[PDB]
Amino acid sequence: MASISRFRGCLAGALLGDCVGAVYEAHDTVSLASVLSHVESLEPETLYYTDDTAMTRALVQSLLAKEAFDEVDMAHRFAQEYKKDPDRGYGAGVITVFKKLLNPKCRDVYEPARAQFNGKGSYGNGGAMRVAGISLAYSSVQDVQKFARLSAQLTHASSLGYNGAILQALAVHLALQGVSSSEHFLEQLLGHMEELEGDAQSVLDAKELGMEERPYSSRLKKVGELLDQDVVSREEVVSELGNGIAAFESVPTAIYCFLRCMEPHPEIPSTFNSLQRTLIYSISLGGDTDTIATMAGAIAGAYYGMEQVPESWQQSCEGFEETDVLAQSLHRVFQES
Ligand SMILES: [Mg+2]
Ligand SMILES: [Mg+2]
Numbered sequence: 001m002a003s004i005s006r007f008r009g010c011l012a013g014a015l016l017g018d019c020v021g022a023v024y025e026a027h028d029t030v031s032l033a034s035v036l037s038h039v040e041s042l043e044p045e046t047l048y049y050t051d052d053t054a055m056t057r058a059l060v061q062s063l064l065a066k067e068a069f070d071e072v073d074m075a076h077r078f079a080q081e082y083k084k085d086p087d088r089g090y091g092a093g094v095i096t097v098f099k100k101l102l103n104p105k106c107r108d109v110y111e112p113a114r115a116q117f118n119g120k121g122s123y124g125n126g127g128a129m130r131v132a133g134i135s136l137a138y139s140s141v142q143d144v145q146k147f148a149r150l151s152a153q154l155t156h157a158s159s160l161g162y163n164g165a166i167l168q169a170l171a172v173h174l175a176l177q178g179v180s181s182s183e184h185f186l187e188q189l190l191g192h193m194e195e196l197e198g199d200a201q202s203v204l205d206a207k208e209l210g211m212e213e214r215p216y217s218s219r220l221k222k223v224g225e226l227l228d229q230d231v232v233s234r235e236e237v238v239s240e241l242g243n244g245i246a247a248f249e250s251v252p253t254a255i256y257c258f259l260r261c262m263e264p265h266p267e268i269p270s271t272f273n274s275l276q277r278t279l280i281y282s283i284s285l286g287g288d289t290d291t292i293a294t295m296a297g298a299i300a301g302a303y304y305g306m307e308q309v310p311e312s313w314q315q316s317c318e319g320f321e322e323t324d325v326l327a328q329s330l331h332r333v334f335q336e337s
Contacts, residue, residue, distance in 0.1 A: 001178070001305050001307075002305075003176070003331060003335055004328065004331050004335075005305035005306045005307065006175075006176050006178075006301075006302050006303075006305045007136055007176075007302075007327045007328070007330055007331040007335065008305070008306045008309075008324055008327040008328065008331075009275075009301035009302060009303075009304060009305040009306045009307075009308065009309055010132055010135075010136060010172060010175075010176065010298055010301040010302035010327065011056070011060075011132065011133075011136075011298075011301070011323050011324070011326060011327040012297075012301050012306065012309045012314060012320065012323060012324065012327070013275060013279075013297035013298050013299075013300050013301020013302070013304075013309070014052070014053070014056060014132055014294050014295075014297050014298040014301065014323075015049060015053055015056075015294075015297075015314075015317050015319070015320060015323045016279060016293075016297050016301075016309070016313055016314065016317060017052075017279055017282070017290070017292075017293030017294035017295065017296060017297030017298070018049050018050055018052040018053045018290050018291075018293065018294040018297075019047035019048065019049050019053070019316070019317040019318065020038070020039060020042075020047060020279055020283065020293060020313065020317075021279070021282070021283045021289040021290040021291070021292070021293030021294065022047065022048070022049075022050050022089070022289075022290045023038065024038075024283055024286065024289040024290075025050075025089070025288065025289055025290045025291075026287070026288070026289075027286050027287075027289065028286055028287065029286050030283060030284055030285070030286040030289065031284070032234075032267050032268070032280070032281075032284045035280050035283045035284045036268075036269075036280060038283075039276070039279075039280060039313065042312050042313050042316045043312045046316060046317070046318050047316050047317050047318060048318045049088070049317065049318050049319060050088050050089040050290050051088045051089050051090040051091070051094075051126075051129075052129040052130065052290055052291055052294045053088075053294070053318075053319070053323070054081055054082075054085065054088045054090075055078060055081070055126070055129065055130035056129070056130045056132065056133060056294075057081070057319075057322075057323075057326065058074070058077040058078050058080075058081040058130075059074060059077075059078075059130050059131070059133045059134070059151060060133040060136075060326045060329075060330060061077055061326075062074035062077045063133055063134075063137045063330065063333075063334075064326070064329055064330065064333060067333055067334075069134075069137070069138075069147040069150060069151065071109055071110070071150060071151075071154065072109055074151060074154060075101050075109035075154045076101065076109070078097075078098065078101070078154060078155065079098045079101040079102050082095070082098040083098070083102060089290075091124060091126060091245070093116060093122045093124060093126075094122070094124075094126050094155050096112070096116065097112040097113050097116065097154075097155050100112035100115075109154060110153055110154065110157070113153060113154060113155050113156060113157040114157045116156075116157060116158075117158070120157075120158055120205070120208065121156060121157025121158035121159075121161060121205075122155065122156045122157065122158055122161050123156065123158040123160035123161040123164075123205075123209070123246055123247055123248070124156060124161060124245050124246060124247060125161075125164055125245055125246065125247040125250045125251065125288065125291050125295075126155055126156055126161075127151070127152030127153075127155055127156040127161050127162055127164065127165035127247065128152070128161075128164045128165040128167070128168040128169075128247050128250070128251050128295060129291050129294055129295060130151075131148050131151060131152065131165045131168050131169045131172070132168075132169070132172045132298040132302075133330065134147045134148050134151055134169050135148075135169045135170075135172040135173040135176060135302075136172075136176070136327070136330040136331070136334065136335075137330060137333075137334045138334070139334075139335070141170065141173065141192070144166075144169050144170060144173050145166050145169070145170070145192070145196070148162075148165050148166045148168070148169035148170070149162045149165065149166055151165070152164075152165030152166070156247070158205050159199075159201050159202045159204075159205040159206075160205050160206065160209065160211075160215065160246070160247060160248060161247050163193070163196055163197065163202060163216055163247070164216065164246075164247025164248055164250070164251040165247065166192070166196060167189060167192075167193060167216055167247075167251045167252070167255075168251050168254070168295055168298070168299075170188075170189055170192055171189060171251075171254075171255055171258070171298075171299045172298050172299055172302050174188060174189070175258075175299045175300070175302035175303035176302045176303075178303065180303065182227065182259045182262055183224075185259065186220060186223060186224050186227075186255075186259065189220055189255065190217060190220040190221065190224075193214070193216040193217045193220055194214070194217050196216075197213065197214040197215070197216055197217050198214075202214075211248075215248040216248060216251070216252065219240075219241055219242075219248060219252035220252055220255070222240045222241060222252070223241065223252055223255060223256045223259065226240060226241075226256060226260075227256070227259055227260060234284060234285055237253070237256060237285060238253075238285055238286070238287070241253040241256055242287075243285045243286055243287025243288060243289075243292060244287055244288055245288050245291070249288075250287075250288055250291055250292050250295065251295060253282075253285065253292055254282065254292050254295035254296040254299065255296075255299065257278055257281055257282035257285070257292070257296040258278055258296050258299045258300050258303070260281065261274060261277045261278035261281050261282075261300075262274065264277075265277060265281060268280055268281065273304075273308045273310070274300070274304055274308060275297075275300050275301065275304045275308035275309065275310075276308070276310060276313070278296050278297070278300040279293050279296065279297055279300070282296040282297075
């Protein structure tokens with residue numbers, strides 16, 4: 001299929017995951033029944049988007065304005081988007097960065113994020129939730145990793161945070177290539193993370209959080225293991241991979257949802273397509289549902305393209321037309337020969 005369809009499907013998938021997943025954010029238990037009724041309610045209010053989409057748009061705006069990654073422009077756009085519309089459900093950690101970036105004396109736009117958590121940086125998934133645009137703008141894996149890291153570091157300075165951003169960007173990147181045997185898709189991601197998590201900073205950051213290094217790599221191994229199981233309960237998936245705000249407790253989970261939902265689920269009606277199945281499933285894990293779903297939706301939209309974006313769901317989402325234009329513009333500016 002055509003890259004323009006993947007570009008449009010990628011940002012549509014992200015919007016859908018955020019908008020559809022939002023009502024369940026932070027809920028520790030979400031039944032599949034509940035999520036099915038929620039999505040079936042879109043096939044007779046608008047579903048408003050949250051911080052995930054707001055930041056996705058600001059990231060894309062910066063790339064489009066500059067035709068390149070520009071850290072100063074992007075940092076300022078994040079701050080100004082928050083100032084403009086702060087009630088979108090931003091996390092408590094990131095607001096401190098935005099206030100510091102709005103300081104008229106701020107000259108190093110990475111400094112506020114570095115200062116988070118007593119100089120250790122945040123390890124939340126806010127860098128990852130918005131990173132899809134990077135993978136749409138940059139086609140080399142080298143650039144994807146570099147600008148995924150840099151964009152993430154404007155708010156999430158811990159390697160535990162920015163490495164989750166890189167992982168997500170790489171997942172979206174592989175999906176855009178249409179890569180994909182499931183086995184090879186995982187292998188490649190596992191390979192990149194094994195290398196990135198072997199750097200001194202990665203090891204130091206995990207250690208000083210108490211985790212047994214290579215949190216992404218050990219979880220991507222677990223994803224494979226889970227995928228080799230005939231049946232895994234939702235509770236088992238959450239126990240092994242997580243469903244939280246920590247990037248290591250959401251990005252691998254997003255990836256498992258994507259890979260798992262390439263095949264049917266016995267409790268998800270076959271009337272739903274693969275993109276739909278992925279989002280219902282991911283939301284049914286509970287926890288950080290808007291963000292896990294927005295990330296799974298990004299990867300899935302990139303892989304399945306606009307043909308699996310349901311009209312009834314899409315047209316229920318706030319800003320779906322604006323989202324589509326941003327996707328097309330990224331393709332025009334960065335991907336078109
Ligand atoms: Mg959100
Ligand atoms: Mg969230």
